[model samples]
Target: FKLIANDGKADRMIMANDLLNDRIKSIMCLRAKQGFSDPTPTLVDIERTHILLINSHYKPFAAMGYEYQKTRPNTGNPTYNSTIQFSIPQFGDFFSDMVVHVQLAATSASAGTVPALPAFIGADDQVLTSTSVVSATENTTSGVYTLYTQSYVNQQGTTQTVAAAATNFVRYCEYPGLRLFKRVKFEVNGNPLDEYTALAAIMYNKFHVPDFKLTGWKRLIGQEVPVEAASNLVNIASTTPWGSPIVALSDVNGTAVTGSPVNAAITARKLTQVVFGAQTPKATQEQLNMFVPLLFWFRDPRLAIASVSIPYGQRFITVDIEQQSNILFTAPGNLFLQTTVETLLTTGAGKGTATGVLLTQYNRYTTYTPTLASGSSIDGTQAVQNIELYINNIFVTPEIHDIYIKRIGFTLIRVYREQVQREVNAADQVLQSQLKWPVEFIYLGLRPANNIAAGNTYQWRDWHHLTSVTNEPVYDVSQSYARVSIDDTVAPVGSTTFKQSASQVMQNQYIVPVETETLDTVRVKAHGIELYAQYRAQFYRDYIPWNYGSFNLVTPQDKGALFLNFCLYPGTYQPSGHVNISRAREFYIEYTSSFCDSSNPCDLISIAKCINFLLI
Candidate 1:
């Protein structure tokens, strides 16, 4: 091939087929991250939230109350003072912090032994606010960092402390706000929510019932959270110092910002967190494979049921003009046209656009009826009710299988046109024009059918694969229509007299009105009506390669001829077999046409008439 105009450069050239040959090889791999792309970005570590670090530096030696300026103490003592500072960069709309809490268990058989006071907290695990790891030499301490902790309902159905009363324990908590952790990746240990265990104890001492409900956080992490009174503590700022940034543990009873969900034998207490400061985290290739974090939950809010409209065509109508003149419409021919068209159009036009007037949606509410017993009166038990429909034996999406226990009051009803494609044309159009002579006219029209299918079976092709043909010469009778025909008028006949009275003479008299009768050859041809009929299909009844009726009917071409058996009824139409003497008809068919006279149905355009007409 000739080279197109281009600078001689490696990247500018088209790939050469002969050059690469079969020896070239390539492998496909999905790299974890990339710069922003449309629709969704290709990025490494989408699981990690990005955090902005604000200035986190502060005076380090302040916690050492009076030891501040002591000369005896080494000013460089690494134990007394250490610091880390960070700035949570503004990311336009919101900010985030990685919240990590470590639970340190204290050793001892005693029922109660809290861990030592003021455990160490690091900005990056390298900067510590407290220098003390101090505890009794005999006590053993172990800590595991976490994101948050809240009440978890356990299998026993109790919402209470993770441990029984008086158990030795220690927990590190953020005093002011947890959002302060936003914008920086802080890891106590590089663990995730997988190891966390969340527990909760809901104790009700009211009504003389001391009941306990146990729950866990593992269930709700990635699941849909009901709007059933979710706390806005994190969304709404509170005057309470430690409460402003924390999520409530309960809808109404108590508050714990536990991100724990329902998973067996696990809670947030056991997991360490790495927050991606200020924003959602990016995923690392390592994290993409080895780890996955609960990034966030997404859902469309339950918008108020604005409106509901059902669409349908009215099958029958009863015109009540005398009573409801406005609703009923009168026709010019005494036979009244029902108000269906008017009503449907007006309602659709008004409501479909202006939502407040009428919404395009139909209300999906539920009503319950009291369940009835065989012999006794109903006892107020509700019966669930719903309206659902299926298409082609396939159930509609978003299954309408819901239990209804309550009844709704307000309901609205409306209908609109559901648009669909249809074929329409004049039933039959026979064209005729007075001419001095006869001539051929090529006529053309299309034949379309509903649910077109294979030859004579029910196995129809898909819509995109449907095929149709048009009659090339719509009303032409002659097949040799390469040229036009000619026609001319003939002279009228003269009348001769028969028996005459005495003295009456019989003479050849010319016809009245000087009749000049002529034969104007016209063409007569059937239109071949494009009427719809049952679709035919093909089915190969056998599977064995040797005994098979057909080879699986693999390609569409293989099934073509078999399908044409539908259009060719043996004796009803074609006197001969489907095709000529011994051949089968072309299965993948095309349309053909012929010529017809423009006027008369019996006579065809004569060659002389066509030539004379052309001359005229």
Candidate 2:
């Protein structure tokens, strides 16, 4: 590729608020091509191709072809949009060239190292399984066969046409294109921050793990995720504040297909096969039924649209939090929590493991039948003969059952992955296994009570109570750690406000044995609120249409936490960001609920943890 004499120009830089840009947003390059006869084009060597931007100093800035290829193969559009952004280029110094390394032919044992574009130019995102020429005999059924005309340039080099020959039969299928997204570098502390991830983290609460609080992923350096934009990922629950709906894509019928887009793309039609006949040839689902990929939901690699080698993008989620997002950055900047992250993890509210946990706990029933008192009905019908057994197959009646599995929670460091990486490398021998979710579940069968009066001298009793998991000191960043419902003798109704102090929430607990005092979070009690913030017991579903499902969460009537109304700002700590503790004060919450009034007075009580220091 080559550029003409005056095509090089350096664009100036510009930054508005958080986004930084150049005066000219992009540099467009054009290439000339015509006719279908040419080596088929593919991105196998995209990274090897370079577009050089040379400055007056003769120093070259190189951009690889693959990095800028925002267009997909078979798009049919003659123009490709190159989204590469670069620096100064001297006039007459613009250049583009392809570079190939190693013989693509049999690059060792790699059968398909380089993506192979099928030799057919007509080949497209749609796949064709068959084509056949049908004779007039097939046209006997009404509207069953499309008639074809014989037309061609024979040895005479002239057009010829025969009026009647039943048309040819062809079968092909197509589906929705996989969408791609872009992620850029961003953070608040030592690392920079980006809008999507940071907001996602803030809203989803990734930092702290227990009772859903903490500044977790600090100190470590993490590379980019979803970098440079390519491919679609399952939609997250946070796709909207209204619900944690599955990722979605529409099908050929314009019906929304939920879950992974891969399944939607290769889904076979309901009708296994059908026939159609018209001059334009008939179209029907019968042929489309052939799309059943046995497993289209095998995860849409996005590369399927191009029919090229599937290059996995952004594999594995990077763990560890960014330091800049910390509510309090400790001395020399290290999370005190990481010191005992394992212990702290145990305190997480629910369903978090330092590693993976299959998301199938919703109404999860332990299958091994506990030998209930024998005469108990095998079918779970209550039998007056046995009172020791369950009435309805309880996961354990918390009140009477001697056995109960308590709430489990944990915050993990990215170290867990590296720990695996290091072990595999150090062991030399390959130790391989796929762990769906690596988090550990230990049922040690703690039996702390001893009874000499029983038939056996040793007796077992579970000493762990489920209380601590739900009431851990992990406070909300609403402003401070303490939210109280205070009593009022002056007025008929009581007012609620948060006590913002680490000391109040127990200074040591908020401090990580001791960190700092910016319990910037505040209390947002919806005493008479109607928010349906769900703490859902997850329901896992497959990408298959039949597996599609949903969850509905409604806030308990007049219960707690609909808003995180951060208290007033402190130019020192509450800076709307880190170097930030809990929260920067706000003039932001838009309330739609009416306050408690004379008609319905609030009968409440408030408690405070005396952090004692109040510039909070």
Tens digit of per-residue lDDT, candidate 1, span 432-482: 222112121111112123212223111111111122222222221112112
C-alpha RMSD (angstroms) for model 1: 48.8
Clash number by candidate, in order: 102, 32
Q: Give TM per candidate.
A: 0.10, 0.13
lDDT for every model?
A: 0.18, 0.18
lDDT of 1 at 173: 15
lDDT of 2 by residue, 387-411 (tens): 0100011121233222211221211
Worst 10 residues of 1 by lDDT: 197-206
Cα shift from native, residue 415, model 1 (Å)? 9.7
lDDT of 1 at 22: 20
Q: What's the distance in Å from true for residue 536, model 1? A: 32
**Candidate 2 residue 479 C-alpha distance from true site, Å:** 34
Quality of model 1 by C-alpha lDDT: 0.18
